[PDB]
Amino acid sequence: SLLPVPYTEAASLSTGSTVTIKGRPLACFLNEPALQVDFHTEMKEESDIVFHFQVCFGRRVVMNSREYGAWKQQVESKNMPFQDGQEFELSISVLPDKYQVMVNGQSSYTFDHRIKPEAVKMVQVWRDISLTKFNVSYLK
Amino acid sequence: SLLPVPYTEAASLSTGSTVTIKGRPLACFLNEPALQVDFHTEMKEESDIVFHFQVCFGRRVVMNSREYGAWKQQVESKNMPFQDGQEFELSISVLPDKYQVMVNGQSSYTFDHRIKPEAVKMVQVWRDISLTKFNVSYLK
């Protein structure tokens, strides 16, 4: 919407950081729009991905990392708190041992750290959404 | 790019019609951007799809129809004429018995008609591309 998609913001993350994303799918769930959030190690889209979060709305969520160019072990979830046609608020919190993904205030997914969060230099949000808010917290 | 994505144009199709699309992926192929072209039976995104064409750039192409709300038999191809980082020209021709998809001037995919092309009322182009040209021919 207001924010360009693909959306790119330089970022740093550590324990206590939160990434907050407000947006809306561009299609009804029957048409299977997607959402992707990638935490990258460099300011280049081809760089490694410490945390890859990909929603196929209405179907599934997959999480992974891309390390030295290669995708690692996929974690697949059928949990689907996102609501057809609705705006969502996505909150990704950096805990000591994992990322925790909140959807509309409800814990919905977690992913244990495979690479230290301090390796992140960039966050990208893309695929079939409009985006009205993006924030990384830097309070701690 | 110039054209909004998702892109929607009311359309009619018959034998001899050609749909021409010029665009560019929004991501490098390592990041697996997608492209989707859907020929719809009504001016609503939830309507049936006479021809569904979905590219996972660098990996595969799937084609299908959605009839009375339900996806039918998927046709999956590993043919991948699209080039990483490059603009493409996509040409979809309505032949008497099938759609023929040309990529950069080369025949790349075909899909036999399951529903008469005259049932199409709308074309949608969406997912991870920018679009600089869209045309439906009406010469015949």
Curated annotation (Swiss-Prot), chains A, B:
Distribution of this protein across tissues and organs: Expressed abundantly in the bone marrow. Expressed exclusively by eosinophils and basophils. Not detected in monocytes and neutrophils. Expressed in CD25-positive regulatory T-cells (Treg) (at protein level). Found in intestinal tissue from patients with Celiac disease, expression is directly related to the histological grade of mucosal damage and to the number of eosinophils found in the duodenal lesion (at protein level). Found in sputum of patients with eosinophilic inflammatory diseases such as asthma (at protein level).
Chief place where the protein resides: cytoplasm
Coiled coil: none
Gene3D superfamilies the record matches: 2.60.120.200
Record keywords, A-Z: Acetylation, Cytoplasm, Lectin
Domain (Galectin): residue spans on this chain: 5-137
One GO BP: regulation of T cell cytokine production
GO cellular component: collagen-containing extracellular matrix; cytosol
Site (Not glycosylated): N135
Keyword Cytoplasm tagged: yes
SUPFAM superfamilies, per the entry: Concanavalin A-like lectins/glucanases
An MF annotation (GO) of this entry: identical protein binding
Superkingdom of origin organism: Eukaryota
InterPro entries: ConA-like_dom_sf, Galectin-like, Galectin_CRD
Modified residues (N-acetylserine): S1
Keyword set includes Nucleotide-binding: no
Annotated localization: Cytoplasm, Cytosol; Cytoplasmic granule
Function: Regulates immune responses through the recognition of cell-surface glycans. Essential for the anergy and suppressive function of CD25-positive regulatory T-cells (Treg).
Subunit structure: Interacts with CEL.
Additional record remark: Forms hexagonal bipyramidal crystals, known as Charcot-Leyden crystals, in tissues and secretions from sites of eosinophil-associated inflammation and some myeloid leukemias.
Protein name listed in UniProt: Galectin-10
Native organism: Homo sapiens
Taxonomic lineage of the native organism: Eukaryota, Metazoa, Chordata, Craniata, Vertebrata
